Symmetry: C6
Subunit: 91 residues, 6 copies
Amino acid sequence: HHQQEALGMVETKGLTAAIEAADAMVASANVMLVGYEKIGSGLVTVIVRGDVGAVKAATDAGAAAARNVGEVKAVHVIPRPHTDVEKILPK
Amino acid sequence: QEALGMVETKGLTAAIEAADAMVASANVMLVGYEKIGSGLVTVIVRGDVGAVKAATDAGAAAARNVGEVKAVHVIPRPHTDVEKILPKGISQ
Amino acid sequence: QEALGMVETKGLTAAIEAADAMVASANVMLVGYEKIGSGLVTVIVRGDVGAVKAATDAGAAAARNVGEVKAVHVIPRPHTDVEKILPKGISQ
Amino acid sequence: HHQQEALGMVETKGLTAAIEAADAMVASANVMLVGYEKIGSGLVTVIVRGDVGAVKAATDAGAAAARNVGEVKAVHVIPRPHTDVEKILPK
Amino acid sequence: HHQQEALGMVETKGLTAAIEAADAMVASANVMLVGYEKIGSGLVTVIVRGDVGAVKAATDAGAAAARNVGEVKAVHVIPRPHTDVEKILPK
Amino acid sequence: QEALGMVETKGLTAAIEAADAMVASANVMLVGYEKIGSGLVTVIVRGDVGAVKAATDAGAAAARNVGEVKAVHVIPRPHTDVEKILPKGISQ
């Protein structure tokens, strides 16, 4: 249907919660895992991409699953243009 | 030469949110991200003074709904070449 | 494919203690360690669901006498290849 | 006049404050920017060099400007011998 | 006598305490220094190896000496099989 | 062989201040700096026992006026070669 493409984040304090978030996200929606990002202070960000509806569903599931394992610091969905979707991401 | 703009957050998600809003206009371009520990992440952009001021305002506005904003600042005219005043290894 | 098990501690000594107990059985194998700052260290193992459950239980049991356990979890069946779901640069 | 040569530091918590300190320092005095140093915990050190009078003037301006932007942790001027001025600095 | 071989840790907050621990450990027992490990947050782990009796004696001395210098976070001895003793250690 | 001296501070500026005072005498030489996170920086020097004792005292005295001193210690005679007892990657 070529709907809006989104970028999805679940940020946790602790890696185990982040791994669970990543697993739960690809388990629920048609999203693909972009990868992990570490910024120190135990903060780990899990990033996925896909349709906004799928990403919103994924990040909701990922956050929910991660909260049963550890601490979730941030959950957000960023709608993106169909080209250069991952351009905004850090190298 | 041209203006330098910074939005610094605690947490990466807020910083990515900030960067997304900052590069959303044509004449603003992303220099990159910087991590210094303690969860602090800085998003740096460059361009005309007006574009940068509007960018950093938009960046901070978007980021604060996601996480904590630690610093917002614009340097209208950097007194040294902007590649000297910036720390090395800025991951775009 | 096979199960994934995590024991996360604050402090390395507790994590090494955890890993020692986790690999103590034959059909459990160590993927490696992961450090993310704030003193947090994660020990990751893989194998059959039952072996991993027993491993993580043993790991957490041993580690808690040495330091603080921050997280214990088993993923029975990872929905993606376990090398994709794991962060890159896992030091064995 | 070949006066005493100094080493100047402004240490902040936060990068934005540090960048402002660096800009303000080279804007006020005849000092040149040696570079940045990161030690984690959000602590960033900006280092300049030049005459003691210039460096004292620079570090004062840099600290003052940085305090309007973020947190300043330390400000100091280290008088140095005319040779191996940057030898004391970390690699 | 081919007794049980052990792995020994002294974990400190601060490097100076860790260096003192390492020195005190090889000074007291027949243990050899494997090396240091840094995990951030000022936490440094000093690791030695040898007979359980020697390692127990070493880690006790190392911890005691380190406590006179700085903060000790953890002290532990891990008995190991005679082969792949350092296999359990991080790369 | 010869004595080992350490001054550990929170903050780099204090550590640089410490190092400046420590190398100020002829027969004291800087091994280098070490960062371990949490803002902790260690300055390490080597030389004769007396020179090192005077160096570390001077280093701590100078550093405490700039920042916090976390640790001061001298090892008169390292029981192992000083390159083994030191952590790897000491940036001079």
